[PDB]
Design an enzyme around this catalytic site. Sequence first.
Site, PDB file in Angstrom:
ATOM      1  N   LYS A  83       4.379   1.762   2.577  1.00 49.66           N
ATOM      2  CA  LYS A  83       3.434   1.959   1.481  1.00 49.66           C
ATOM      3  C   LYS A  83       4.126   1.648   0.172  1.00 49.66           C
ATOM      4  CE  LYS A  83       0.288   5.524  -0.384  1.00 49.66           C
ATOM      5  NZ  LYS A  83      -0.161   6.921  -0.076  1.00 49.66           N
ATOM      6  N   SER A 141      -4.875   7.278   0.491  1.00 49.74           N
ATOM      7  CA  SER A 141      -4.305   6.135  -0.197  1.00 49.74           C
ATOM      8  C   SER A 141      -3.369   5.249   0.637  1.00 49.74           C
ATOM      9  CB  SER A 141      -3.608   6.598  -1.490  1.00 49.74           C
ATOM     10  OG  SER A 141      -2.557   7.518  -1.237  1.00 49.74           O
ATOM     11  N   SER A 178      -3.900  11.530   2.532  1.00 54.51           N
ATOM     12  CA  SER A 178      -3.548  10.135   2.294  1.00 54.51           C
ATOM     13  C   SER A 178      -2.801   9.454   3.450  1.00 54.51           C
ATOM     14  CB  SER A 178      -2.770   9.990   0.968  1.00 54.51           C
ATOM     15  OG  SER A 178      -2.846  11.155   0.134  1.00 54.51           O
TER      16      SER A 178
END
Length: 490
Positions: free
Chosen positions: A82, A161, A185
């Site tokens: 990420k 996210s 997330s």
Amino acid sequence: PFPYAETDVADLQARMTAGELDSTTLTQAYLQRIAALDRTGPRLHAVIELNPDALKEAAERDRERRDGRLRGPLHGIPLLLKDNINAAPMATSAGSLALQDFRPDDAYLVRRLRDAGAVVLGKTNLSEWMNFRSNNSISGWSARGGQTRNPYRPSHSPCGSSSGSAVAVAANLASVAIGTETDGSIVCPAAINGVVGLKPTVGLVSRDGIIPISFSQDTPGPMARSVADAAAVLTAIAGRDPADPATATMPGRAVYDYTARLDPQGLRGKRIGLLQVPLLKYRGMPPLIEQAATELRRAGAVVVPVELPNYGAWAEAERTLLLYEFKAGLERYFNTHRAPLRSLADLIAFNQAHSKQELALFGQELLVEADATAGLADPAYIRARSDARRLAGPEGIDAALAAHQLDALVAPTTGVAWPIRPEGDDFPGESYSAAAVAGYPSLTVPMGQIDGLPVGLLFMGTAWSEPKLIEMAYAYEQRTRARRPPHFDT
């Protein structure tokens, strides 16, 4: 046919050990598949930046292997990170144009992964600023990465996210990935894209070198198509880091290989509470959650209905602590890593100066709100932090576990993917907030689909229960195998 579709880390490692595959060839396979699916075809937009050193690293790992010098189970395994996680020589942008040229040194967990022999393929897109920019945000969108799409149905949301990491794993763009969770997330996009996501206890894995929201709630965690793959990743990244005081709070920190907890009898004699929450009646859910309970029992678990009264009563307190912690944490991070922004004010000012590219779809209202917070010495903050944690942990998850002598609680993770719209997310509900707010471990496993869209079964436990959660999740997964590959429905 993609030859490495749905292939576990153990199996990739076996193929490499036999000489039928190597890291360089495997890395080339993923790179070519990324080229075919990420910015053309279904346009998944999972990968925000490729690692220019990916093939150099793959070649190093293969040379080591040829000399009979392996680093362990992750040797030569390509993975994605990420893009809030620092990894040289890539940028770490949080999806923002303000940080497109900001290339800090490796995060602690990245150093660990590289020493373990993993190959960093690149960075994955995320909801800009870990979805803490606006309440009107569109999950999986960032200015620098564009719109990440769900591979099951690219018109629909990947959640976030950790959007790109979930998507990439689900679409076999890498072997495994790393995500981060503040509240949902990791486990939300994992569930939404039909993969396994594991959010550890806060402190199991260092948060050093990660663009933060919350010192209290943030943790990185593995995202993978299978529990075994997730366990292999967790083994490599778990550990104490003097840079992150949260990792000092773990009692009985011991060297631990979580793949030893991959026991098909892992549910025998376990007691599980099926959480009585609104998602049980989400449209299309009852047959799935009923079947899941049944499969848990068939695996030898005792499954009982349980309440977590006033689920979500920590919401107000959590919102408050996150606003305060985001400002303080971000500003510290920018200072530590000598970023080109040094304050939240700087970021807000940048976004207004770049409004056409940054603020076209939605605003930055939560940035503004966080920037207004007085700081961590405000008693309102102190009370909110203490209250949220107490409600979700001791009085929430722990009270439920203790009252029924349970090993874990389970619930549907969330609903299914929703259409990507300019209006922002049409969010269906969650059962992951308690664990996130408690700082306690959670783990989502695919349990089926509704209308061709994945849904997950969430396991949650008390602090430091990852070994047991992994056994139970694995045993569930091995008798159900409910994950199906995406096929990009229109």
